[PDB]
Amino acid sequence: IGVCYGMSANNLPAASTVVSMFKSNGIKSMRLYAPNQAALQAVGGTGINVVVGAPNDVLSNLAASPAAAASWVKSNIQAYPKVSFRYVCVGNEVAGGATRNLVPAMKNVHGALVAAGLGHIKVTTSVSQAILGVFSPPSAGSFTGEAAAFMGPVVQFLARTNAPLMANIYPYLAWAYNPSAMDMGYALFNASGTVVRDGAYGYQNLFDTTVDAFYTAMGKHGGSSVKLVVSESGWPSGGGTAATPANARFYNQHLINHVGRGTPRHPGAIETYIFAMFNENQKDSGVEQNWGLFYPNMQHVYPINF
């Protein structure tokens, strides 16, 4: 499975040590949110797959010039011939206005990559489950109107380039919003049976419901051929309602065991990245500083089998 290597902390291990943690725990993929040189130099030649992202503040730059895109690829992708790049995630949850630069930046990075003969590395973007206006039942999946306005061209692009869509999916967050609306077990991979019967499909967990809702919404804009990659998913071990190591372990371990099967309407392993490797101490107090599978001190927050 994959794990998101977030670095919004002032006390993490050296990149090299982190890379050993991936290796020994059997974490096959890594997600970076920006071309970190130390991490990229470390991960090279290890067989760990890497999703390298382009920060949201450089999009306008990648969108404006093809040559800009080219330079980026030369310094951030080409500079590292021994790393195993899977995708280049242009933007992470890009909100209003800036979304105007989404497709152009994506087109430019893509062309730069094809020009270098590295077209095996897919360009995509990562969206937030918050873009779903309706997510239940799955057949009634749909984007908000704000998202609907920019998601069309993005989805079609992906379809044209045979690239997936990446979605940051958190049942915990859907549930926490109004704990009175749904039962926590439904979100925790701990429901007894079907909670939602959609047509001839029955959902037993909020992860599937969302993923399938995404597919339905994507379909409405010519994305029926595009695959979804879960670029983030997790549950916090402290800082809020239901935030404990017992719950976070129950959630993460079931996620890990679950993804290879797929969903009711989409059977087949879903590429998944768990958020995140460590607790991040530079985030705002609350659950944000508790997504980590590990403490900076390198100890597991709870036991997990990857």
Tell me the three-class secondary structure of 193-256, residue by residue.
Answer: CCCEEECCEEECCHHHHHHHHHHHHHHCCCCCCCCEEEEECCCCCCCCCCCCHHHHHHHHHHHH
Contact 79, 55 (CB under 8 A): no
Give, rounded to a whole angstrom, the gap between the first and last alpha carbons of the chain.
Answer: 7
- Return the ∠ at Cα 78 (arms to 62 and 225), rounded to 5°: 60
CATH no. for residue 259? 3.20.20.80
Overall size of the chain counted in residues: 306
CA dihedral for 164, 165, 168, 172, sign (positive or negative): negative
Both tokens of residue 178?
Answer: 């109004």
- Helix H or strand E segment including 43: helix 37-43
What phi and psi values does residue 161 have, to the nearest 5 degrees? -105, 5
Both tokens of residue 209?
Answer: 């419901």
How does DSSP assign 100-168, residue by residue?
GGHHHHHHHHHHHHHHHT-TTSEEEEEEEGGGEEE-SSGGG-EE-HHHHHHHHHHHHHHHHHT--EEEE
- For residue 276, whether the previous peptide bond is cis, meaning omega lies within 30 degrees of 0, is yes
Cβ neighbours around 221 below 10 Å, total: 17
Contact 67, 109 (CB under 8 A): no
Q: At what angle do helices 145-161 and 102-116 cross, to 10 degrees?
A: 10
Number of domains in the chain: 1
Method: X-ray
What phi and psi values does residue 180 have, to the nearest 5 degrees? -85, -20
Distance CA 251, CA 158 (A): 30
Contact 90, 109 (CB under 8 A): yes
Distance CA 297, CA 228 (A): 34
Residue 98 DSSP label: G
Specify burial of residue 93 (Cβ count, 10 A radius: 0-12, 13-18, 19+). middle
Active-site amino acid positions: 93, 232
- In the three-class reduction of DSSP (H, G, I as helix; E, B as strand; rest coil), residue 16 is classed as helix
Pairing of strands 2-4, 29-31: parallel
Distance CA 116, CA 150 (A): 29
Q: Max CA-CA distance within the chain?
A: 55
Residues β-bridged to residue 273:
2
Q: Which domain holds residue 160?
A: 1-306
- Return the ∠ at Cα 11 (arms to 272 and 54), rounded to 5°: 45
- Helix H or strand E segment including 39: helix 37-43
Percentage helix, strand, coil for the chain under 3-state DSSP, each rounded to 5: 40, 20, 40
